[PDB]
Amino acid sequence: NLKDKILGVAKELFIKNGYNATTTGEIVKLSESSKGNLYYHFKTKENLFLEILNIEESKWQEQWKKEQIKAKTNREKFYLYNELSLTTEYYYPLQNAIIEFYTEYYKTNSINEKMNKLQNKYIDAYHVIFKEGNLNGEWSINDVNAVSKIAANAVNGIVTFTHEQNINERIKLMNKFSQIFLNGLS
Amino acid sequence: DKILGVAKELFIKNGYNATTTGEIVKLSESSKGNLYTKENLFLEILNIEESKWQEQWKKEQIKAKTNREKFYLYNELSLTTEYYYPLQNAIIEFYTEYTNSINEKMNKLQNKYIDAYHVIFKEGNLNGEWSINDVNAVSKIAANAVNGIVTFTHEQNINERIKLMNKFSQIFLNGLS
Ligand SMILES: Cc1cc(N)c2ccccc2[n+]1CCCCCCCCCC[n+]1c(C)cc(N)c2ccccc21
Protein backbone atom coordinates (compact mmCIF):
# COMPACT_ATOMS: atom_id res chain seq x y z
CA ASN A 1 0.00 0.00 0.00
CA LEU A 2 3.06 2.28 -0.38
CA LYS A 3 2.09 3.46 -3.88
CA ASP A 4 -1.51 4.12 -2.74
CA LYS A 5 -0.29 5.67 0.54
CA ILE A 6 1.97 8.09 -1.38
CA LEU A 7 -0.91 9.14 -3.65
CA GLY A 8 -3.23 9.57 -0.66
CA VAL A 9 -0.74 11.76 1.18
CA ALA A 10 0.25 13.63 -1.98
CA LYS A 11 -3.41 14.32 -2.71
CA GLU A 12 -3.81 15.93 0.75
CA LEU A 13 -0.55 17.93 0.43
CA PHE A 14 -1.61 19.25 -2.99
CA ILE A 15 -4.97 20.15 -1.45
CA LYS A 16 -3.47 21.93 1.57
CA ASN A 17 -0.58 23.72 -0.16
CA GLY A 18 -1.16 23.61 -3.96
CA TYR A 19 0.93 21.97 -6.68
CA ASN A 20 3.95 24.28 -6.84
CA ALA A 21 4.46 24.49 -3.07
CA THR A 22 4.29 20.73 -2.44
CA THR A 23 7.76 19.17 -2.82
CA THR A 24 8.55 15.50 -3.45
CA GLY A 25 10.68 15.55 -0.28
CA GLU A 26 7.54 16.19 1.72
CA ILE A 27 5.60 13.42 0.00
CA VAL A 28 8.49 10.99 0.59
CA LYS A 29 8.93 11.63 4.33
CA LEU A 30 5.20 11.96 5.12
CA SER A 31 4.29 8.68 3.41
CA GLU A 32 7.33 7.01 5.02
CA SER A 33 8.91 6.14 1.67
CA SER A 34 11.96 6.98 -0.45
CA LYS A 35 12.93 9.19 -3.39
CA GLY A 36 13.74 5.87 -5.08
CA ASN A 37 10.28 4.33 -4.70
CA LEU A 38 8.65 7.62 -5.72
CA TYR A 39 10.92 7.75 -8.78
CA TYR A 40 10.27 4.10 -9.70
CA HIS A 41 6.49 4.59 -9.54
CA PHE A 42 6.00 8.11 -10.95
CA LYS A 43 9.37 9.52 -12.14
CA THR A 44 8.24 13.13 -11.62
CA LYS A 45 5.99 15.28 -9.44
CA GLU A 46 4.23 16.08 -12.72
CA ASN A 47 3.44 12.44 -13.44
CA LEU A 48 2.50 11.59 -9.85
CA PHE A 49 -0.03 14.42 -10.03
CA LEU A 50 -1.46 13.00 -13.29
CA GLU A 51 -1.80 9.61 -11.62
CA ILE A 52 -3.83 11.17 -8.77
CA LEU A 53 -6.06 12.77 -11.44
CA ASN A 54 -6.54 9.27 -12.91
CA ILE A 55 -7.65 7.92 -9.53
CA GLU A 56 -9.89 10.98 -9.14
CA GLU A 57 -11.43 10.60 -12.62
CA SER A 58 -12.16 6.94 -11.87
CA LYS A 59 -13.86 7.83 -8.57
CA TRP A 60 -15.92 10.40 -10.49
CA GLN A 61 -17.02 7.82 -13.06
CA GLU A 62 -17.82 5.38 -10.25
CA GLN A 63 -19.80 8.15 -8.52
CA TRP A 64 -21.65 8.92 -11.76
CA LYS A 65 -22.65 5.25 -12.29
CA LYS A 66 -24.46 5.27 -8.92
CA GLU A 67 -25.85 8.79 -9.29
CA GLN A 68 -27.25 8.39 -12.85
CA ILE A 69 -29.87 5.86 -11.71
CA LYS A 70 -31.80 8.95 -10.51
CA ALA A 71 -32.20 9.71 -14.24
CA LYS A 72 -34.51 7.34 -16.15
CA THR A 73 -34.14 8.96 -19.61
CA ASN A 74 -30.95 10.24 -21.25
CA ARG A 75 -32.49 13.75 -21.44
CA GLU A 76 -32.71 13.54 -17.66
CA LYS A 77 -29.14 12.18 -17.48
CA PHE A 78 -27.89 15.16 -19.55
CA TYR A 79 -29.59 17.70 -17.24
CA LEU A 80 -28.29 15.89 -14.16
CA TYR A 81 -24.68 15.44 -15.21
CA ASN A 82 -24.30 19.14 -16.00
CA GLU A 83 -25.78 20.11 -12.63
CA LEU A 84 -23.47 17.67 -10.85
CA SER A 85 -20.53 19.08 -12.79
CA LEU A 86 -21.39 22.59 -11.58
CA THR A 87 -22.40 21.84 -7.98
CA THR A 88 -19.66 19.35 -7.08
CA GLU A 89 -16.88 21.59 -8.53
CA TYR A 90 -17.91 24.32 -6.09
CA TYR A 91 -16.41 22.23 -3.26
CA TYR A 92 -13.83 20.11 -5.09
CA PRO A 93 -10.65 20.63 -3.04
CA LEU A 94 -8.17 19.52 -5.71
CA GLN A 95 -9.65 22.04 -8.17
CA ASN A 96 -7.17 24.76 -7.24
CA ALA A 97 -4.15 22.46 -7.58
CA ILE A 98 -5.54 21.39 -10.97
CA ILE A 99 -5.84 25.02 -12.21
CA GLU A 100 -2.29 25.58 -11.01
CA PHE A 101 -1.08 22.33 -12.62
CA TYR A 102 -2.63 22.70 -16.07
CA THR A 103 -1.71 26.38 -16.39
CA GLU A 104 1.95 25.31 -16.22
CA TYR A 105 2.40 22.10 -18.27
CA TYR A 106 -0.05 22.79 -21.13
CA LYS A 107 2.98 23.46 -23.40
CA THR A 108 4.77 20.11 -22.81
CA ASN A 109 3.14 17.93 -25.49
CA SER A 110 3.65 14.66 -23.54
CA ILE A 111 2.03 15.94 -20.32
CA ASN A 112 -0.64 17.58 -22.49
CA GLU A 113 -0.92 14.18 -24.23
CA LYS A 114 -1.88 12.36 -21.02
CA MET A 115 -4.09 15.27 -19.89
CA ASN A 116 -6.12 14.75 -23.07
CA LYS A 117 -6.64 11.02 -22.54
CA LEU A 118 -8.05 12.26 -19.22
CA GLN A 119 -10.48 14.83 -20.66
CA ASN A 120 -11.49 12.18 -23.20
CA LYS A 121 -12.78 10.22 -20.20
CA TYR A 122 -14.95 13.19 -19.16
CA ILE A 123 -16.15 13.46 -22.76
CA ASP A 124 -17.05 9.73 -22.79
CA ALA A 125 -19.84 10.39 -20.26
CA TYR A 126 -21.65 12.59 -22.78
CA HIS A 127 -20.88 10.25 -25.65
CA VAL A 128 -22.74 7.52 -23.77
CA ILE A 129 -25.73 9.75 -22.94
CA PHE A 130 -26.03 10.70 -26.62
CA LYS A 131 -25.50 7.22 -28.09
CA GLU A 132 -28.12 5.80 -25.73
CA GLY A 133 -30.39 8.76 -26.44
CA ASN A 134 -30.31 7.82 -30.13
CA LEU A 135 -31.15 4.18 -29.43
CA ASN A 136 -34.29 5.35 -27.54
CA GLY A 137 -35.46 8.01 -30.01
CA GLU A 138 -34.90 10.83 -27.53
CA TRP A 139 -33.07 12.62 -30.32
CA SER A 140 -31.11 11.99 -33.54
CA ILE A 141 -27.41 12.88 -33.66
CA ASN A 142 -25.34 11.60 -36.55
CA ASP A 143 -22.23 13.34 -35.11
CA VAL A 144 -22.16 12.04 -31.52
CA ASN A 145 -18.41 12.51 -31.07
CA ALA A 146 -18.74 16.17 -32.06
CA VAL A 147 -21.80 17.05 -29.98
CA SER A 148 -20.13 15.30 -27.02
CA LYS A 149 -16.98 17.46 -27.23
CA ILE A 150 -19.18 20.54 -27.54
CA ALA A 151 -21.34 19.72 -24.50
CA ALA A 152 -18.39 18.88 -22.23
CA ASN A 153 -16.59 22.13 -23.09
CA ALA A 154 -19.69 24.31 -23.15
CA VAL A 155 -20.51 23.01 -19.67
CA ASN A 156 -16.94 23.58 -18.36
CA GLY A 157 -17.15 27.18 -19.51
CA ILE A 158 -20.41 27.73 -17.67
CA VAL A 159 -18.89 26.04 -14.62
CA THR A 160 -15.57 27.92 -14.76
CA PHE A 161 -16.32 31.45 -15.99
CA THR A 162 -19.39 32.22 -13.86
CA HIS A 163 -18.20 31.80 -10.18
CA GLU A 164 -19.01 35.49 -9.47
CA GLN A 165 -22.74 34.65 -9.31
CA ASN A 166 -24.60 32.98 -6.40
CA ILE A 167 -25.11 29.23 -6.49
CA ASN A 168 -28.85 29.29 -7.23
CA GLU A 169 -28.56 31.56 -10.24
CA ARG A 170 -25.69 29.45 -11.58
CA ILE A 171 -27.83 26.29 -11.32
CA LYS A 172 -30.76 28.08 -13.06
CA LEU A 173 -28.49 29.12 -15.92
CA MET A 174 -26.91 25.68 -16.25
CA ASN A 175 -30.34 24.04 -16.40
CA LYS A 176 -31.42 26.69 -18.91
CA PHE A 177 -28.42 25.81 -21.05
CA SER A 178 -29.26 22.14 -20.72
CA GLN A 179 -32.73 23.01 -22.02
CA ILE A 180 -31.62 25.17 -24.97
CA PHE A 181 -29.01 22.63 -26.01
CA LEU A 182 -31.32 19.62 -26.00
CA ASN A 183 -33.92 21.63 -27.92
CA GLY A 184 -31.41 22.34 -30.69
CA LEU A 185 -30.78 18.61 -31.17
CA SER A 186 -34.42 18.18 -32.22
CA ASP B 1 2.66 51.38 -21.81
CA LYS B 2 6.20 49.97 -21.58
CA ILE B 3 5.04 47.81 -18.65
CA LEU B 4 1.60 46.78 -19.99
CA GLY B 5 3.06 45.24 -23.16
CA VAL B 6 5.52 42.97 -21.33
CA ALA B 7 3.00 42.17 -18.59
CA LYS B 8 0.52 40.92 -21.22
CA GLU B 9 3.27 38.78 -22.81
CA LEU B 10 4.39 37.45 -19.42
CA PHE B 11 0.81 36.83 -18.18
CA ILE B 12 0.07 35.00 -21.47
CA LYS B 13 3.30 32.94 -21.58
CA ASN B 14 3.19 31.99 -17.87
CA GLY B 15 0.45 32.21 -15.23
CA TYR B 16 -0.97 35.08 -13.18
CA ASN B 17 0.89 33.68 -10.17
CA ALA B 18 3.99 32.61 -12.14
CA THR B 19 4.63 36.12 -13.53
CA THR B 20 5.89 38.51 -10.86
CA THR B 21 6.37 42.17 -9.90
CA GLY B 22 10.14 41.70 -10.26
CA GLU B 23 9.92 39.83 -13.56
CA ILE B 24 7.69 42.59 -14.97
CA VAL B 25 10.07 45.45 -14.11
CA LYS B 26 13.38 43.69 -14.92
CA LEU B 27 12.23 42.26 -18.29
CA SER B 28 10.54 45.53 -19.34
CA GLU B 29 13.56 47.50 -18.02
CA SER B 30 11.80 50.10 -15.82
CA SER B 31 11.58 51.53 -12.28
CA LYS B 32 10.22 49.40 -9.43
CA GLY B 33 8.44 52.39 -7.86
CA ASN B 34 7.08 53.45 -11.28
CA LEU B 35 4.44 50.70 -11.09
CA TYR B 36 3.31 51.47 -7.51
CA THR B 37 -1.14 46.38 -6.92
CA LYS B 38 -0.50 43.50 -9.36
CA GLU B 39 -4.25 42.83 -9.35
CA ASN B 40 -4.70 46.47 -10.40
CA LEU B 41 -2.29 46.02 -13.32
CA PHE B 42 -4.04 42.79 -14.31
CA LEU B 43 -7.58 44.25 -14.29
CA GLU B 44 -6.15 47.11 -16.36
CA ILE B 45 -4.84 44.74 -19.07
CA LEU B 46 -8.11 42.82 -19.13
CA ASN B 47 -10.00 46.05 -19.80
CA ILE B 48 -7.55 47.06 -22.55
CA GLU B 49 -7.76 43.64 -24.27
CA GLU B 50 -11.53 43.29 -23.84
CA SER B 51 -11.88 46.68 -25.58
CA LYS B 52 -9.46 45.71 -28.36
CA TRP B 53 -11.64 42.66 -28.98
CA GLN B 54 -15.04 44.40 -28.92
CA GLU B 55 -13.53 47.06 -31.18
CA GLN B 56 -12.18 44.45 -33.65
CA TRP B 57 -15.60 42.78 -33.50
CA LYS B 58 -17.34 46.03 -34.56
CA LYS B 59 -14.91 46.52 -37.46
CA GLU B 60 -15.68 42.89 -38.45
CA GLN B 61 -19.37 42.24 -37.65
CA ILE B 62 -20.39 44.25 -40.77
CA LYS B 63 -19.68 41.11 -42.82
CA ALA B 64 -22.74 39.44 -41.19
CA LYS B 65 -26.08 40.49 -42.70
CA THR B 66 -28.43 38.81 -40.20
CA ASN B 67 -27.95 38.44 -36.45
CA ARG B 68 -28.09 34.66 -36.81
CA GLU B 69 -24.89 35.13 -38.83
CA LYS B 70 -23.42 37.59 -36.30
CA PHE B 71 -23.71 34.87 -33.61
CA TYR B 72 -21.91 32.22 -35.72
CA LEU B 73 -19.22 34.70 -36.69
CA TYR B 74 -18.50 36.28 -33.29
CA ASN B 75 -18.06 32.75 -31.95
CA GLU B 76 -15.85 31.69 -34.90
CA LEU B 77 -13.78 34.85 -34.52
CA SER B 78 -13.44 34.19 -30.78
CA LEU B 79 -11.15 31.30 -31.71
CA THR B 80 -8.95 33.37 -34.04
CA THR B 81 -8.48 36.77 -32.29
CA GLU B 82 -5.28 37.71 -30.45
CA TYR B 83 -7.40 39.64 -27.94
CA TYR B 84 -8.83 38.75 -24.52
CA TYR B 85 -9.36 35.02 -25.07
CA PRO B 86 -5.63 34.30 -24.81
CA LEU B 87 -5.82 35.62 -21.20
CA GLN B 88 -8.56 33.21 -20.08
CA ASN B 89 -6.35 30.69 -18.21
CA ALA B 90 -4.71 33.67 -16.46
CA ILE B 91 -8.15 34.82 -15.36
CA ILE B 92 -8.98 31.33 -13.99
CA GLU B 93 -6.00 31.55 -11.62
CA PHE B 94 -6.86 35.15 -10.83
CA TYR B 95 -10.21 34.11 -9.32
CA THR B 96 -8.67 31.27 -7.27
CA GLU B 97 -5.63 33.25 -6.06
CA TYR B 98 -7.92 36.25 -5.35
CA THR B 99 -11.00 40.41 -1.62
CA ASN B 100 -13.97 42.76 -2.21
CA SER B 101 -13.02 45.97 -4.09
CA ILE B 102 -11.60 43.86 -6.97
CA ASN B 103 -13.71 40.65 -7.11
CA GLU B 104 -16.96 42.65 -7.36
CA LYS B 105 -15.30 45.33 -9.55
CA MET B 106 -14.42 42.86 -12.35
CA ASN B 107 -18.09 41.96 -12.89
CA LYS B 108 -18.21 45.24 -14.85
CA LEU B 109 -15.67 43.52 -17.11
CA GLN B 110 -17.99 40.50 -17.41
CA ASN B 111 -20.98 42.62 -18.41
CA LYS B 112 -18.88 44.14 -21.23
CA TYR B 113 -18.03 40.62 -22.42
CA ILE B 114 -21.70 39.56 -22.22
CA ASP B 115 -22.98 42.75 -23.92
CA ALA B 116 -21.80 41.56 -27.34
CA TYR B 117 -24.42 38.78 -27.20
CA HIS B 118 -27.02 41.07 -25.63
CA VAL B 119 -27.00 43.24 -28.75
CA ILE B 120 -27.00 40.24 -31.09
CA PHE B 121 -29.93 38.71 -29.22
CA LYS B 122 -31.92 41.93 -28.66
CA GLU B 123 -31.36 42.91 -32.30
CA GLY B 124 -32.58 39.50 -33.44
CA ASN B 125 -35.75 40.01 -31.38
CA LEU B 126 -36.44 43.29 -33.22
CA ASN B 127 -35.52 41.64 -36.55
CA GLY B 128 -37.91 38.72 -35.80
CA GLU B 129 -35.29 35.97 -36.24
CA TRP B 130 -36.24 34.42 -32.90
CA SER B 131 -37.98 35.28 -29.65
CA ILE B 132 -35.92 35.45 -26.44
CA ASN B 133 -37.78 36.71 -23.36
CA ASP B 134 -34.79 35.88 -21.13
CA VAL B 135 -32.12 37.63 -23.24
CA ASN B 136 -29.77 38.37 -20.37
CA ALA B 137 -29.69 34.76 -19.21
CA VAL B 138 -29.17 33.52 -22.77
CA SER B 139 -26.38 36.06 -23.20
CA LYS B 140 -24.57 34.88 -20.06
CA ILE B 141 -24.98 31.24 -21.11
CA ALA B 142 -23.86 31.96 -24.69
CA ALA B 143 -20.79 33.90 -23.60
CA ASN B 144 -19.67 31.27 -21.12
CA ALA B 145 -20.37 28.18 -23.26
CA VAL B 146 -18.36 29.74 -26.06
CA ASN B 147 -15.51 30.82 -23.77
CA GLY B 148 -15.51 27.15 -22.76
CA ILE B 149 -15.11 25.85 -26.29
CA VAL B 150 -12.43 28.46 -26.96
CA THR B 151 -10.45 27.85 -23.78
CA PHE B 152 -10.68 24.10 -23.07
CA THR B 153 -9.65 23.00 -26.59
CA HIS B 154 -6.52 25.22 -27.11
CA GLU B 155 -4.41 22.17 -28.00
CA GLN B 156 -5.81 20.84 -31.30
CA ASN B 157 -6.27 21.60 -35.01
CA ILE B 158 -7.60 25.17 -35.32
CA ASN B 159 -9.79 24.23 -38.28
CA GLU B 160 -11.39 21.39 -36.28
CA ARG B 161 -12.07 23.86 -33.45
CA ILE B 162 -13.86 26.16 -35.89
CA LYS B 163 -16.00 23.22 -37.03
CA LEU B 164 -17.02 22.41 -33.46
CA MET B 165 -17.77 26.07 -32.70
CA ASN B 166 -20.08 26.22 -35.72
CA LYS B 167 -21.88 22.98 -34.84
CA PHE B 168 -22.34 24.58 -31.41
CA SER B 169 -23.76 27.88 -32.73
CA GLN B 170 -26.20 25.95 -34.87
CA ILE B 171 -27.52 23.83 -31.97
CA PHE B 172 -27.75 26.80 -29.62
CA LEU B 173 -29.78 28.86 -32.08
CA ASN B 174 -31.87 25.87 -33.16
CA GLY B 175 -32.92 25.50 -29.51
CA LEU B 176 -34.04 29.13 -29.20
CA SER B 177 -36.74 28.85 -31.89
C1 LIG C 1 -12.95 13.67 -8.70
C2 LIG C 1 -13.76 14.71 -9.42
C3 LIG C 1 -14.69 15.41 -8.66
C4 LIG C 1 -15.48 16.39 -9.25
N5 LIG C 1 -16.37 17.03 -8.46
C6 LIG C 1 -15.32 16.66 -10.61
C7 LIG C 1 -16.09 17.65 -11.24
C8 LIG C 1 -15.94 17.92 -12.60
C9 LIG C 1 -15.00 17.20 -13.34
C10 LIG C 1 -14.22 16.23 -12.72
C11 LIG C 1 -14.36 15.93 -11.35
N12 LIG C 1 -13.61 14.97 -10.74
C13 LIG C 1 -12.59 14.20 -11.48
C14 LIG C 1 -11.26 14.97 -11.47
C15 LIG C 1 -10.39 14.72 -12.70
C16 LIG C 1 -9.82 16.03 -13.24
C17 LIG C 1 -9.03 15.82 -14.54
C18 LIG C 1 -8.94 17.11 -15.36
C19 LIG C 1 -7.53 17.38 -15.90
C20 LIG C 1 -7.53 18.35 -17.08
C21 LIG C 1 -7.78 19.80 -16.65
C22 LIG C 1 -8.97 20.46 -17.37
N23 LIG C 1 -8.51 21.61 -18.18
C24 LIG C 1 -8.43 21.46 -19.52
C25 LIG C 1 -8.80 20.17 -20.21
C26 LIG C 1 -8.00 22.50 -20.33
C27 LIG C 1 -7.64 23.71 -19.76
N28 LIG C 1 -7.22 24.70 -20.59
C29 LIG C 1 -7.72 23.86 -18.38
C30 LIG C 1 -7.37 25.07 -17.76
C31 LIG C 1 -7.45 25.22 -16.39
C32 LIG C 1 -7.89 24.16 -15.61
C33 LIG C 1 -8.24 22.96 -16.21
C34 LIG C 1 -8.17 22.79 -17.60
Return the residue whose CA atom lies nearest to atom 20 of ligand 1: A115
Same domain, A19 and A88: no
Q: Cα–Cα distances in Å, from A24 out to A10, A95, B80, B99, B146? A: 9, 20, 40, 32, 38
Count up the domains in chain B and report the number: 2
Chain A 21-50, CB below 8 Å of chain B: which residues?
A: none
Q: Count of A–B CB contacts within 8 Å?
A: 117
Q: Are A164 and B107 in contact (CB under 8 A)?
A: yes
Count Cβ atoms below 10 Å from residue B101 Cβ, excluding itself.
8
Binary contact (B172, A180; C-beta < 8 A): yes
Same domain, B18 and B73: no
Same domain, B78 and B127: yes
What is the spatial distance between Cα A122 and Cα A141, in angstroms, rounded to a whole number? 19
What is the spatial distance between Cα A10 and Cα A44, in angstroms, rounded to a whole number? 13
B17 contacts on A by Cβ (under 8 Å) = 20, 100
Same domain, B104 and B118: yes
Same domain, A124 and A65: yes
Cα(A154) to centroid of ligand 1, in Å? 14
Angle at B28 between CA B25 and CA B32, to 5 degrees: 20
Q: How far is B176 from chain A (nearest CA, A)?
A: 6
Ramachandran area for residue A163 (φ above 0: left; ψ -120 to 50: alpha; else beta): left
What is the spatial distance between Cα B15 and Cα A106, in angstroms, rounded to a whole number? 11
What is the spatial distance between Cα A58 and Cα A83, in angstroms, rounded to a whole number? 19
Same domain, B83 and B160: yes
- How many Å from the N-terminal Cα to the C-terminal Cα in chain A? 51
| CATH number, domain with residue B5 | 1.10.10.60
Same domain, A84 and A161: yes
Reported structure resolution in angstroms: 2.9
Structural domain that includes position A17: 1-49
B18 contacts on A by Cβ (under 8 Å) = 103-104
A177 contacts on B by Cβ (under 8 Å) = 141, 145
Same domain, B37 and B50: no
Chain A 94-123, CB below 8 Å of chain B: which residues?
A: 95-96, 99-100, 102-104, 106, 112, 116, 119
